[PDB]
């Protein structure tokens, strides 16, 4: 009664461009996290094996053991930079400033989260202030929501009239990454992969597809 169609399956030598996501010259600030659609390709993770000294890799809602057998309509790669001690928040069901105000994974999340330390790239001894996160918001984010407003936050009771000051903060904090910090305050690059299967022909398959051609 339904169908299963291979009309949009990929050429088996056409590997998903994961490496290009991972060796980007610069990553996004987490408040303005960046998303990349991956499709019409084979999701062979050998292309980023040992690409960096990875810190964490965990999947949610799908088992990594089954991944190479699986097919998807799309993969979404979100990438940003956060503090060492905030990585635990890039997972379902977390709270804290990153999970509440910057990047919120849903409870039914299906995908994986890869993180690595990038001190030697993202921290000047002068201090790299280019990386920011959102410290203040009136409310928590919805799953996969993005917020890039630079409206002055009214902490207290008196309106701020768009001018910062006592109880009126700019809502973005910088990390000021300097190489001498504790790992908790060092920069970690993060990539979140979303695996999507709508009711349509798939366009991404794991490398197990490759065996049929022998």
């Amino acid at each position: 009664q339904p169908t299963e169609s291979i009309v949009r399956f990929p050429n088996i030598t056409n590997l998903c461009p994961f490496h290009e996501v991972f060796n980007a010259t610069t990553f996004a600030s987490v408040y303005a996290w960046n998303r990349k659609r991956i499709s019409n390709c084979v999701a062979d993770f050998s292309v980023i094996y040992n690409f960096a000294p990875f810190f964490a890799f965990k999947c949610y809602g799908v088992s990594p053991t089954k991944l190479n057998d699986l097919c998807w309509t799309n993969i979404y790669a979100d990438s940003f930079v956060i503090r060492g001690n905030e990585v635990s928040q890039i997972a379902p069901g977390q709270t804290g400033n990153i999970a509440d105000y910057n990047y919120k994974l849903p409870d039914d999340f299906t995908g994986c989260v890869i993180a690595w330390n990038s001190n030697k790239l993202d921290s000047k001894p002068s201090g790299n202030y280019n990386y920011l996160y959102r410290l203040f918001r009136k409310s928590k984010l919805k799953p996969f929501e993005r917020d890039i407003s630079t409206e002055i936050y009214q902490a207290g009771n008196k309106p701020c009239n768009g001018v910062a000051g006592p109880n009126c903060y700019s809502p973005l904090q910088s990390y000021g990454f300097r190489p001498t910090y504790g790992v908790g305050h060092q920069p970690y690059r993060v990539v979140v992969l979303s695996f999507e299967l709508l009711h349509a022909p798939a366009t991404v398959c794991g490398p197990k597809l490759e065996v049929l051609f022998q």
Partner: antibody, heavy 122, light 111 residues
């Protein structure tokens, strides 16, 4: 099911090169997500990873052995082999081959060979 | 670098439950998947747990793996213990660009 079988010389003179081979049956080596791995267990010690290879030809080996290790795949795609140079008595061990499922930091060894004992002795 | 540490031996009586922990240093064991291998002298090592807590087909539900980030440990737990459960058990994971094995624990079924 895939089945792994080591084979190689029982005895190796100190400072020469250990060569082993794994024969893979019920399956073949290809760019399908699986890596092909050597490990070992020295006497009284525990399991110790050596290195593995993907059909792309990329290798990764244990840092404490990396200089001396070299793994390769036979063009028949039913064997891979281990070479370990300048062995000493400390390389006496049971050497195992295994299939490895490898994604980022997730490596799961399964199944394993039965191991072949290699003795370094004059 | 990232190391996993297991006690050298554990023992328990048949039918009871025994736990084998695997404790990290220079790293967070909850950050990367942990496997458990059973190794009977003279035999291929086999898998009792992969992906922290998954059981291959054929491994009885008496085996179960758990992770505890608060004490930075991983645990294999064996219930309804049998004399055939005697083996060395190894935890394994990854960290600092290297496959990492715990030193192994010998399990002894007493009584």
């Amino acid at each position: 099911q895939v089945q792994l079988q080591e084979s190689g010389p029982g005895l190796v003179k100190p400072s020469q090169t250990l060569s082993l081979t794994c024969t893979v049956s019920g399956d073949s080596i290809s760019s399908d997500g699986y890596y092909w791995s050597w490990l070992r267990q020295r006497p009284g010690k525990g399991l110790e990873w050596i290195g593995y290879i993907y059909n792309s030809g990329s290798t990764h080996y244990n840092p404490s052995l990396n200089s001396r290790v070299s793994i390769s795949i036979d063009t028949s795609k039913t064997q891979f082999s281990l070479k370990l140079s300048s062995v000493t008595a400390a390389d006496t061990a049971v050497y195992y081959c295994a299939r490895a499922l490898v994604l980022i930091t997730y490596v799961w060894f399964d199944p394993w060979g039965q191991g072949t004992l290699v003795t370094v002795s004059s | 670098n990232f190391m996993l540490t297991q006690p050298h031996s554990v023992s328990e009586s048949p039918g009871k439950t025994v736990t084998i922990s695997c404790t990290g240093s220079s790293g967070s064991v909850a950050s990367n998947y942990v496997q458990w291998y059973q190794h009977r002298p003279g035999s291929a090592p086999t898998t009792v747990i992969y992906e922290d807590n998954q059981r291959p087909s054929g491994v009885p539900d008496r085996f179960s793996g758990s992770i505890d980030s608060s004490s930075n440990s991983a645990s294999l737990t064996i219930s309804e213990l049998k004399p055939e459960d005697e083996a060395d058990y190894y935890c394994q994971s990854y960290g600092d660009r290297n496959v990492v094995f715990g030193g192994g624990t010998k399990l002894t079924v007493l009584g």
